[PDB]
Design a protein around this motif. Sequence first.
Motif, PDB file in Angstrom:
ATOM      1  N   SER B   7       0.785  -1.257  -0.019  1.00 38.36           N
ATOM      2  CA  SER B   7       0.069   0.165  -0.110  1.00 38.36           C
ATOM      3  C   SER B   7       0.775   1.256  -0.022  1.00 38.36           C
ATOM      4  CB  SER B   7      -0.910   0.114   1.339  1.00 38.36           C
ATOM      5  OG  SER B   7      -1.502  -1.178   1.071  1.00 38.36           O
ATOM      6  N   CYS B   8       0.693   1.882  -0.923  1.00 40.23           N
ATOM      7  CA  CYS B   8       1.615   2.995  -1.146  1.00 40.23           C
ATOM      8  C   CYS B   8       0.963   4.404  -1.050  1.00 40.23           C
ATOM      9  CB  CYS B   8       2.661   3.038  -2.704  1.00 40.23           C
ATOM     10  SG  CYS B   8       3.219   1.319  -3.074  1.00 40.23           S
ATOM     11  N   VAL B   9       1.470   5.580  -0.639  1.00 39.24           N
ATOM     12  CA  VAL B   9       0.945   6.877  -0.288  1.00 39.24           C
ATOM     13  C   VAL B   9       1.904   7.643  -1.081  1.00 39.24           C
ATOM     14  CG1 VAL B   9      -0.352   6.490   1.505  1.00 39.24           C
ATOM     15  CG2 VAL B   9       2.137   7.206   1.702  1.00 39.24           C
ATOM     16  N   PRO B  10       1.257   8.641  -2.077  1.00 35.61           N
ATOM     17  CA  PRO B  10       2.019   9.534  -2.784  1.00 35.61           C
ATOM     18  C   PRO B  10       3.113  10.557  -2.180  1.00 35.61           C
ATOM     19  CG  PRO B  10      -0.243  10.329  -2.521  1.00 35.61           C
ATOM     20  CD  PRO B  10       0.108   8.839  -2.005  1.00 35.61           C
ATOM     21  N   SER B  11       3.762  11.034  -2.890  1.00 33.01           N
ATOM     22  CA  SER B  11       5.039  11.917  -2.554  1.00 33.01           C
ATOM     23  C   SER B  11       4.403  13.349  -1.792  1.00 33.01           C
ATOM     24  CB  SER B  11       6.115  12.230  -3.426  1.00 33.01           C
ATOM     25  OG  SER B  11       6.722  11.144  -3.952  1.00 33.01           O
ATOM     26  N   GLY B  12       4.457  13.526  -0.664  1.00 25.50           N
ATOM     27  CA  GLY B  12       3.912  14.785   0.268  1.00 25.50           C
ATOM     28  C   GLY B  12       2.930  14.386   1.127  1.00 25.50           C
ATOM     29  N   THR B  13       2.570  13.093   1.232  1.00 28.38           N
ATOM     30  CA  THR B  13       1.695  12.602   2.323  1.00 28.38           C
ATOM     31  C   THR B  13       2.274  12.886   3.647  1.00 28.38           C
ATOM     32  OG1 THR B  13       0.799  11.128   0.664  1.00 28.38           O
ATOM     33  CG2 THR B  13       0.253  10.545   3.130  1.00 28.38           C
ATOM     34  N   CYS B  14       1.572  13.149   4.517  1.00 31.29           N
ATOM     35  CA  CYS B  14       2.147  13.424   5.898  1.00 31.29           C
ATOM     36  C   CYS B  14       1.227  12.724   6.793  1.00 31.29           C
ATOM     37  CB  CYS B  14       2.041  15.015   6.209  1.00 31.29           C
ATOM     38  SG  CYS B  14       2.936  15.884   5.142  1.00 31.29           S
ATOM     39  N   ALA B  15       1.941  12.143   7.939  1.00 29.52           N
ATOM     40  CA  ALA B  15       1.128  11.151   8.905  1.00 29.52           C
ATOM     41  C   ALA B  15       1.636  11.768  10.362  1.00 29.52           C
ATOM     42  CB  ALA B  15       1.519   9.921   8.701  1.00 29.52           C
ATOM     43  N   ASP B  16       0.755  11.478  11.177  1.00 25.25           N
ATOM     44  CA  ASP B  16       1.169  11.726  12.580  1.00 25.25           C
ATOM     45  C   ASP B  16       1.758  10.623  13.197  1.00 25.25           C
ATOM     46  OD1 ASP B  16      -0.074  11.958  15.630  1.00 25.25           O
ATOM     47  OD2 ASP B  16       0.565  13.836  15.064  1.00 25.25           O
ATOM     48  N   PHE B  17       3.101  10.874  14.019  1.00 25.42           N
ATOM     49  CA  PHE B  17       3.812  10.200  14.545  1.00 25.42           C
ATOM     50  C   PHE B  17       4.039  10.362  15.785  1.00 25.42           C
ATOM     51  CE2 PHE B  17       4.672   9.137  10.217  1.00 25.42           C
ATOM     52  CZ  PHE B  17       4.684   7.937  10.140  1.00 25.42           C
ATOM     53  N   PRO B  18       4.602   9.705  17.071  1.00 24.42           N
ATOM     54  CA  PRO B  18       5.086  10.037  18.110  1.00 24.42           C
ATOM     55  C   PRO B  18       6.588  10.527  18.094  1.00 24.42           C
ATOM     56  CG  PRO B  18       4.229   7.919  18.327  1.00 24.42           C
ATOM     57  CD  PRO B  18       4.385   8.156  16.922  1.00 24.42           C
ATOM     58  N   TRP B  19       6.994  11.422  19.033  1.00 23.02           N
ATOM     59  CA  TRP B  19       8.387  11.539  19.246  1.00 23.02           C
ATOM     60  C   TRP B  19       9.282  10.334  19.249  1.00 23.02           C
ATOM     61  CZ3 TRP B  19      12.700  11.619  22.518  1.00 23.02           C
ATOM     62  CH2 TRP B  19      13.486  12.718  22.404  1.00 23.02           C
ATOM     63  N   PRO B  20      10.477  10.254  18.662  1.00 25.80           N
ATOM     64  CA  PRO B  20      11.040  11.623  17.803  1.00 25.80           C
ATOM     65  C   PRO B  20      10.826  11.754  16.679  1.00 25.80           C
ATOM     66  CG  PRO B  20      12.563   9.772  18.000  1.00 25.80           C
ATOM     67  CD  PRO B  20      11.276   9.229  18.357  1.00 25.80           C
ATOM     68  N   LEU B  21       9.691  11.117  15.916  1.00 26.72           N
ATOM     69  CA  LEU B  21       9.308  11.596  14.756  1.00 26.72           C
ATOM     70  C   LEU B  21       8.314  12.560  14.585  1.00 26.72           C
ATOM     71  CD1 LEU B  21       9.833   8.426  14.429  1.00 26.72           C
ATOM     72  CD2 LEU B  21       8.462   8.358  12.528  1.00 26.72           C
ATOM     73  N   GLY B  22       7.345  12.814  15.248  1.00 25.81           N
ATOM     74  CA  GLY B  22       6.404  13.712  15.463  1.00 25.81           C
ATOM     75  C   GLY B  22       5.522  13.961  14.143  1.00 25.81           C
ATOM     76  N   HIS B  23       5.624  15.079  13.628  1.00 22.48           N
ATOM     77  CA  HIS B  23       5.083  15.538  12.495  1.00 22.48           C
ATOM     78  C   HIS B  23       5.958  15.033  11.285  1.00 22.48           C
ATOM     79  CE1 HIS B  23       6.912  19.476  11.589  1.00 22.48           C
ATOM     80  NE2 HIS B  23       6.953  19.795  12.768  1.00 22.48           N
ATOM     81  N   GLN B  24       5.375  14.140  10.545  1.00 19.24           N
ATOM     82  CA  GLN B  24       6.475  13.432   9.259  1.00 19.24           C
ATOM     83  C   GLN B  24       5.804  13.461   8.110  1.00 19.24           C
ATOM     84  OE1 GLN B  24       9.583  13.140   9.024  1.00 19.24           O
ATOM     85  NE2 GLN B  24       9.832  13.710  11.402  1.00 19.24           N
ATOM     86  N   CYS B  25       6.327  13.810   7.145  1.00 14.64           N
ATOM     87  CA  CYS B  25       5.825  13.736   5.838  1.00 14.64           C
ATOM     88  C   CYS B  25       6.740  12.798   5.096  1.00 14.64           C
ATOM     89  CB  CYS B  25       5.730  14.976   5.006  1.00 14.64           C
ATOM     90  SG  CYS B  25       4.558  16.341   6.220  1.00 14.64           S
ATOM     91  N   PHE B  26       6.101  12.321   3.910  1.00 10.39           N
ATOM     92  CA  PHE B  26       6.807  11.260   3.075  1.00 10.39           C
ATOM     93  C   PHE B  26       7.291  12.120   1.720  1.00 10.39           C
ATOM     94  CE2 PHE B  26       3.482   9.026   5.516  1.00 10.39           C
ATOM     95  CZ  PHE B  26       4.374   8.388   6.577  1.00 10.39           C
ATOM     96  N   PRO B  27       8.312  12.593   1.459  1.00 12.92           N
ATOM     97  CA  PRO B  27       8.941  13.488   0.359  1.00 12.92           C
ATOM     98  C   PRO B  27       9.050  12.634  -0.894  1.00 12.92           C
ATOM     99  CG  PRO B  27      10.528  13.075   1.880  1.00 12.92           C
ATOM    100  CD  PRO B  27       9.481  12.676   2.620  1.00 12.92           C
ATOM    101  N   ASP B  28       9.405  11.370  -0.551  1.00 14.53           N
ATOM    102  CA  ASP B  28       9.556  10.447  -1.883  1.00 14.53           C
ATOM    103  C   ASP B  28       8.268   9.550  -1.945  1.00 14.53           C
ATOM    104  OD1 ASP B  28      12.404  11.244  -0.599  1.00 14.53           O
ATOM    105  OD2 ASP B  28      12.332  11.012  -2.695  1.00 14.53           O
TER     106      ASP B  28
END
Lengths: 28, 28
Positions: B7-28
Amino acid sequence: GFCWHHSCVPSGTCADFPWPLGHQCFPD
Amino acid sequence: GFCWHHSCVPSGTCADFPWPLGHQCFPD
């Protein structure tokens, strides 16, 4: 666990991703 | 972008993660 951009969360961290991923939990 | 369990999500998708990720986006 999950490492993304050098930030790593331990095994047991479950995150809610968008479709079609959904809730994915990381055993590593 | 990001893909997991085929299951793939497009470049620019962002998801909510806990620290130390926090707010992360998937640029690729």
